[model samples]
Target: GSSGSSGVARSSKLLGWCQRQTDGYAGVNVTDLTMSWKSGLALCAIIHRYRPDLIDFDSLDEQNVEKNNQLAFDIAEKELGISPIMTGKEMASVGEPDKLSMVMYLTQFYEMFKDSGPSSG
Candidate 1:
């Protein structure tokens, strides 16, 4: 009965988790794992939610996708120990980012922060 629902359930909860993390960020609404993440603010907002000091959310611009994504990617890799799943340019230029890639990439952050205590505002 529950044979093949693992992946589906995993992705569904993951999407919802990310949406919750970025819920209140300005100009960021996670509707899907593709176009909704193209601006990179979604990712930045997620990281900022867990590690506010690592990212300056208020100063970021949605139009600066590359830099925004790069900042998050590098910080996650360097500070948080999460690997970079894709470059900012790749994520930005792709127009519609890869679904699985975004999923897995975000999964890493979820894994790291999910068990941590509440973040400060």
Candidate 2:
């Protein structure tokens, strides 16, 4: 007998658990994920503490989208101690429309604040 299970299957199983624990803030759709330098930093922090394993980075030249994303990721990691595993597609889309990028960053922001009780600041 041969039983085959794919990564998607495993992720789907885990997805429910993550959603329950994080209040449905654990998953991100590729189309919905946007990007922004400021929000990206915050997301880095949140993902570093929550989903460190998923962050990825690829280098690009100064005027390239990859470079900007990598720079943002680095800032998040170095300044905020976040290490969000980024997909290559994410890195490539860094220079997308500002609104779209902001939306991507908001996904992370929403995740961070969803269950947080309060801010003392």
Candidate 3:
């Protein structure tokens, strides 16, 4: 396909665990719409990392999603070094880093720093 998922690899099951975990993640009124969009999973994955309670739920709101998601991507690239927004050839490399994988990655980071106090923007 033109998106270049051909070269992307999993390396390990854990890398794509969220794809399974969040597959049927239905919330209020059994809404699982976010599962259809990488951006939704992306924002949610990094919520705790940027949240005050370590239980970030604001992104669940449509109004807050875009800004929060953008921050999530910025943090992943700037600090986590696990970018999913690569362009051109880089976008065509092995381990394409889909939203599910990104969720797994950021969730781990949240756990790693859960007790390290609040993160600064």
Candidate 4:
């Protein structure tokens, strides 16, 4: 039916939202739901945008792929309670990451920070 594309639309909407959050980073740009996140910088960039203290963006090396991912995932989990549905190892692989899994995981970040600010009282 016509409903099949709804899921794709919704997930891609998140992808676009993530793109906005990660915009203006030196080496970060989210254009897709999979390989765009391979380096994990995009993931960390989004977090750093909202919580600069939680992550030192300068120290994150894209060459240290797995470690970069682990750092982001761990910080999000321990500091913000976001679930780690994807592992660092998996995300560091050459193959494409699971699109929906990444989207779902990032959704938690969106939900947590969407209405956040000094005026959220």
What's each prediction's TM-score? 0.83, 0.29, 0.34, 0.83
Q: How far is candidate 1 from the true structure (C-alpha RMSD, Å)?
A: 3.8
**Model 1 agreement with the true structure over 1-121: per-residue lDDT tens digits:** 2666544544477888887888887878788887777777888888888678899888887779889988988888889888887888987788586677778877888888777865555
Q: How accurate is candidate 1 locally (lDDT)?
A: 0.80
Backbone clashes in model 3: 1
Superposition TM-score, candidate 3 onto the true structure:
0.34
Cα lDDT tens digits for candidate 2, 36-113: 232233233344344454443212232344544565466555654545456434756545434444445434544554
lDDT of 4 by residue, 1-121 (tens): 2665544454476777787778888777677877778788888887888778898788888777788788888999888988687788977875887767777877888888777877632
Per-prediction count of colliding residue pairs? 0, 8, 1, 0
The true-versus-predicted C-alpha distance at residue 21 of model 1, in Å, is 1.5
Estimate every model's Cα lDDT from 0 to 1: 0.80, 0.42, 0.43, 0.79
- Which residue pairs in candidate 4 collide? none
TM-score of 1: 0.83
Local accuracy of candidate 3 as per-residue lDDT tens digits, 1-121: 3665666444334334434433343432212222333334444443443443533544355444344455545555555554644332332233334655444644565454445555454
RMSD of each: 3.8, 12.3, 10.7, 4.1
User: If both were scored by lDDT, which would come out higher, candidate 1 or candidate 2?
Assistant: 1
